[PDB]
């Protein structure tokens, strides 16, 4: 498997709350 840093290091949207900066880069988890 080719390793990519953002596959292993991303920000879940569930901790963004009401901060726009985090909502702009988060990754929603279904």
């Amino acid at each position, epitope marked *: *498997n*080719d*390793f*990519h*840093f*953002e*596959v*292993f*290091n*991303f*920000v*879940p949207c*569930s*901790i963004c709350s009401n*901060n726009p*900066t*985090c909502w702009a*880069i988060c990754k929603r*988890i279904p």
Partner: antibody
Amino acid sequence: EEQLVESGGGLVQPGRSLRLSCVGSGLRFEEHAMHWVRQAPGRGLEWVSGISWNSGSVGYADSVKGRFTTSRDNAKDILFLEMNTLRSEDTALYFCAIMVATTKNDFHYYKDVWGKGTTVTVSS
Amino acid sequence: QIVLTQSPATLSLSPGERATLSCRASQSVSNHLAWYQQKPGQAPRLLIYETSNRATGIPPRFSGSGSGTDFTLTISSLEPEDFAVYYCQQRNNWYTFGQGTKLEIKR
């Protein structure tokens, strides 16, 4: 309370098999990549294996390639390490860990969670 | 994968002095270098992530710098709680730890 709890370690004969589990508690299990890190007595830390949140990407250290298999079942908050044809040199304490960190960009996020470890002893 | 070489193997200093630990990478790890502290009988604890960011609860006497191949962990005035083993860890190409630096009390 976030917690990682390992189990399944113990005394095993060389060439035989073992399976470690790691159960999460207090965290959205599906949301983080997980890792197995081991430490032999009086030695340093060695990354063993890592698996992404949806098991889309798995990696292994060269010292365990072809012998270990890392999987996870998000519906039960559990991570597995299956170890085959074990050798004395895999005698170590085995840590379950989440190690996420990103500063991209202008936002700082990290997650660093370790279990207390389970001990694996490979010997005749 | 990438190999992390740490120096020195052992660092002997007394509390109140400044500690400098180095981490050299065989290949560029960009900025994805973390620093961990471990004491005997305990799980490791994250101090610095992404080269220079301190984790929560980490005093500002810990400082991290560098890029690419070369990285430095600086502890400005040593406290007795800071004597332990330190590992750097890259996350640019999978995950590997350095072999560790032991920071010991000189007397």
